[PDB]
Design an enzyme around this catalytic site. Structure first.
Site, mmCIF file in Angstrom:
data_model
loop_
_atom_site.group_PDB
_atom_site.id
_atom_site.type_symbol
_atom_site.label_atom_id
_atom_site.label_comp_id
_atom_site.label_asym_id
_atom_site.label_seq_id
_atom_site.Cartn_x
_atom_site.Cartn_y
_atom_site.Cartn_z
ATOM 1 N N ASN A 87 -2.067 -0.497 -4.903
ATOM 2 C CA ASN A 87 -2.872 -0.568 -3.696
ATOM 3 C C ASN A 87 -2.700 0.705 -2.871
ATOM 4 O O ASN A 87 -1.576 1.108 -2.580
ATOM 5 C CB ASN A 87 -2.433 -1.839 -3.015
ATOM 6 C CG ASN A 87 -3.190 -2.165 -1.776
ATOM 7 O OD1 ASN A 87 -3.439 -1.317 -0.920
ATOM 8 N ND2 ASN A 87 -3.525 -3.448 -1.638
ATOM 9 N N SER A 95 -6.346 -3.454 6.245
ATOM 10 C CA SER A 95 -5.188 -3.623 7.094
ATOM 11 C C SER A 95 -5.569 -3.740 8.545
ATOM 12 O O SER A 95 -6.324 -2.913 9.042
ATOM 13 C CB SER A 95 -4.276 -2.476 6.998
ATOM 14 O OG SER A 95 -3.177 -2.621 7.880
ATOM 15 N N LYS A 142 -10.274 -4.391 -1.250
ATOM 16 C CA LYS A 142 -9.640 -5.521 -0.590
ATOM 17 C C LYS A 142 -10.214 -5.631 0.829
ATOM 18 O O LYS A 142 -10.147 -4.689 1.619
ATOM 19 C CB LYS A 142 -8.120 -5.337 -0.535
ATOM 20 C CG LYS A 142 -7.374 -6.532 0.032
ATOM 21 C CD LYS A 142 -5.886 -6.480 -0.263
ATOM 22 C CE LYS A 142 -5.149 -7.674 0.345
ATOM 23 N NZ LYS A 142 -3.710 -7.544 0.031
ATOM 24 N N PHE A 186 1.763 0.454 7.424
ATOM 25 C CA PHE A 186 1.764 1.282 6.206
ATOM 26 C C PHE A 186 3.002 2.161 6.082
ATOM 27 O O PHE A 186 2.885 3.360 5.780
ATOM 28 C CB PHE A 186 0.508 2.179 6.097
ATOM 29 C CG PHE A 186 -0.734 1.488 5.624
ATOM 30 C CD1 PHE A 186 -0.717 0.296 4.898
ATOM 31 C CD2 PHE A 186 -1.948 2.094 5.851
ATOM 32 C CE1 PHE A 186 -1.911 -0.276 4.451
ATOM 33 C CE2 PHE A 186 -3.123 1.517 5.430
ATOM 34 C CZ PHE A 186 -3.117 0.354 4.693
ATOM 35 N N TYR A 211 2.125 -14.054 -1.300
ATOM 36 C CA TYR A 211 3.304 -13.390 -0.779
ATOM 37 C C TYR A 211 4.032 -14.336 0.173
ATOM 38 O O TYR A 211 5.175 -14.742 -0.104
ATOM 39 C CB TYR A 211 2.937 -12.054 -0.148
ATOM 40 C CG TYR A 211 4.084 -11.251 0.485
ATOM 41 C CD1 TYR A 211 5.441 -11.627 0.372
ATOM 42 C CD2 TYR A 211 3.803 -10.087 1.189
ATOM 43 C CE1 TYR A 211 6.450 -10.911 0.993
ATOM 44 C CE2 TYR A 211 4.812 -9.351 1.768
ATOM 45 C CZ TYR A 211 6.123 -9.770 1.673
ATOM 46 O OH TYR A 211 7.108 -9.024 2.289
ATOM 47 N N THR A 255 -4.612 -10.117 5.609
ATOM 48 C CA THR A 255 -4.227 -10.929 6.740
ATOM 49 C C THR A 255 -5.263 -10.957 7.832
ATOM 50 O O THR A 255 -6.190 -10.133 7.839
ATOM 51 C CB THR A 255 -2.910 -10.408 7.321
ATOM 52 O OG1 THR A 255 -3.075 -9.020 7.655
ATOM 53 C CG2 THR A 255 -1.799 -10.581 6.352
ATOM 54 N N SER A 260 0.813 -1.223 0.000
ATOM 55 C CA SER A 260 0.000 0.000 0.000
ATOM 56 C C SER A 260 0.834 1.254 0.000
ATOM 57 O O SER A 260 1.890 1.319 0.644
ATOM 58 C CB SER A 260 -0.951 0.037 1.182
ATOM 59 O OG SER A 260 -1.923 -1.029 1.126
ATOM 60 N N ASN A 284 -3.439 -3.098 10.864
ATOM 61 C CA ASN A 284 -2.361 -2.355 11.553
ATOM 62 C C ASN A 284 -2.456 -0.844 11.444
ATOM 63 O O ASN A 284 -1.461 -0.153 11.693
ATOM 64 C CB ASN A 284 -1.006 -2.836 11.004
ATOM 65 C CG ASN A 284 -0.873 -4.338 11.097
ATOM 66 O OD1 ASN A 284 -1.154 -4.911 12.144
ATOM 67 N ND2 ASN A 284 -0.443 -4.981 10.021
ATOM 68 N N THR A 285 -3.644 -0.340 11.096
ATOM 69 C CA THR A 285 -3.960 1.103 11.247
ATOM 70 C C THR A 285 -5.271 1.206 11.982
ATOM 71 O O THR A 285 -6.267 0.595 11.559
ATOM 72 C CB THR A 285 -4.008 1.825 9.891
ATOM 73 O OG1 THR A 285 -2.690 1.818 9.369
ATOM 74 C CG2 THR A 285 -4.467 3.316 10.006
ATOM 75 N N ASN A 304 2.796 -9.704 10.688
ATOM 76 C CA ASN A 304 3.382 -8.372 10.457
ATOM 77 C C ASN A 304 2.509 -7.282 11.028
ATOM 78 O O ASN A 304 1.273 -7.370 11.036
ATOM 79 C CB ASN A 304 3.643 -8.139 8.969
ATOM 80 C CG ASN A 304 2.442 -7.605 8.254
ATOM 81 O OD1 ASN A 304 2.215 -6.402 8.252
ATOM 82 N ND2 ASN A 304 1.632 -8.494 7.668
#
Ligand code: A1AQL
Ligand code: FMN
Ligand code: ORO
Ligand code: CL
Ligand code: CL
Ligand code: CL
EC number: 1.3.5.2
Length: 366
Positions: free
Chosen positions: A151, A185, A225, A119, A326, A255, A90, A187-188, A115
């Protein structure tokens, strides 16, 4: 081919991974790939693997997922590996550092990664100039069946998420074959709430308006996504919105913030998104549901735990037109691409399919 596969998986990759921290291994991989320091992609793509979707020809249906090449540094090297399409990002509007280190964790006993990069991004301007440097080279690759996706993310400190995505459409839309509105995500803070109905409709309307304002030759497909952790209600709402607005496709999935029973890695309780084998079937089942909820009328890119032809074909039969990987690359290295492709071709022949296209959604017709 199978020589290289074995050596990479059994010896080279475990040795290199044992010498390096996981983020260093990622950074070095990007550098090596950008330099073309890669084994021969022995595999010749056959007509059976060609897919036409999203207004493009894809020479083969196996792509590199977002997160490997976040800043568009390794695109040409990734085509050299044998990927049929590449997704970068991203990318966030402004540059940002992401989370403190360590923020990547290997779970080799689970063939998984966790992970929490958060970002980390060079930002739209840097990436724009990087893609502009090879814009016509990309036009030829796309014409030749090798499309590019971008992305888009949002900055950590942004007050107006929709404006961040709109900026990404304006800046990178003209350089992309497709764009991804990454609302999944883990993770934000607050990001996955953008998957809710009212917020999503407003966000996506703005994104599509911006996309529609680009000149025709510079007008990308727009995909959303989604997470693997959505409620049934969330999935029904996304499906509704996607059909209402004419979103071009879905990427299924990002994820997971879940920790499936049975993980063995010492680092299983680290915060972040889990990828690789433990995500596989959760992702396949999300594909299956999204295909059903959209009547098979919305192309899906299937992603999560693909490391074999069987894994790819299960996603295709569940509804995916294309797949990405990935995490398997981190264990198997570059030869995994030709492995997946060879195994997928073999399975298509064994199951009576003329090509990939004939297998898309085949499970729903049983
Ligand atoms: C999730 C972060 N993450 C991790 C850690 O969890 N690993 N990883 C990764 C590393 C590598 C590596 C490294 C071991 C290097 F670079 F340190 F060796 C080499 N190669 C390679 C081998 C032979 C020839 C050309 C290359 C590029 C790869 O393909 C490759 C792919 C990857 F996804 C990656 O993105
Ligand atoms: C280290 C890492 C970084 C990632 N960063 C991104 C990202 O920036 N944007 C995104 O949409 N997905 C990101 N992903 C998610 C992947 O694109 C993919 O959806 C997920 O890892 C499942 O596929 P896999 O099991 O084949 O890795 C990242 C994944 C990993 C492992
Ligand atoms: O940057 C990240 O942390 C990241 C983003 C994303 O969409 N998915 C993921 O697993 N990590
Ligand atoms: Cl680790
Ligand atoms: Cl342009
Ligand atoms: Cl978490």
């Amino acid at each position: 081919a199978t020589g290289d596969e074995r050596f990479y998986a059994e010896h080279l990759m475990p040795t290199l991974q044992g010498l390096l921290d996981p983020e260093s291994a990622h950074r070095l991989a990007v550098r090596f790939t950008s330099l073309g320091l890669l084994p021969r992609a022995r595999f010749q793509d056959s007509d059976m693997l060609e897919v036409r979707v999203l207004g493009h020809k894809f020479r083969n249906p196996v792509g590199i997922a977002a997160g490997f090449d976040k800043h568009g540094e390794a695109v040409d090297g990734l085509y050299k590996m044998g990927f049929g399409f590449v997704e970068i990002g991203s990318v966030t509007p402004k540059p940002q550092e992401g989370n403190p280190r360590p923020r990547v964790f290997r779970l080799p006993e689970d063939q998984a990664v966790i992970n929490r990069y958060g970002f980390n991004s060079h930002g739209l301007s840097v990436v724009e100039h990087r893609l502009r440097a090879r814009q016509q080279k990309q036009a030829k690759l796309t014409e030749d069946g090798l499309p590019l996706g971008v992305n888009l993310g949002k900055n950590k400190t942004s007050v107006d998420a929709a404006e961040d995505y709109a900026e990404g459409v304006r800046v990178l839309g003209p350089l992309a074959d497709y764009l991804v509105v990454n609302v999944s995500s883990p993770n934000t803070a607050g990001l996955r709430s953008l998957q809710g109905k009212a917020e999503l409709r407003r966000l996506l309307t703005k994104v599509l308006q911006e996309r529609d304002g680009l000149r025709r030759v510079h007008r990308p497909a727009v995909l959303v996504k989604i997470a693997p952790d959505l409620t049934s209600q969330d999935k029904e709402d996304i499906a509704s919105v996607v059909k209402e607005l004419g979103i071009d496709g879905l990427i299924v999935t990002n994820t997971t913030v879940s920790r499936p029973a049975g993980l063995q890695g010492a680092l299983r309780s680290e915060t972040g998104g889990l990828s690789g084998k433990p995500l596989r079937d959760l992702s396949t089942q999300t594909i299956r549901e999204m295909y059903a909820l959209t009547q098979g009328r919305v192309p899906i890119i299937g992603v999560g735990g693909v490391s074999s032809g069987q894994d790819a074909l299960e996603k295709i039969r569940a509804g995916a037109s294309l797949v990405q990987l990935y995490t398997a690359l981190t264990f198997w290295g570059p030869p995994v691409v030709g492995k997946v492709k060879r195994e997928l071709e073999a399975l298509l022949k064994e199951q009576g399919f003329g090509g990939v296209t004939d297998a898309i959604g085949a499970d729903h017709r049983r």
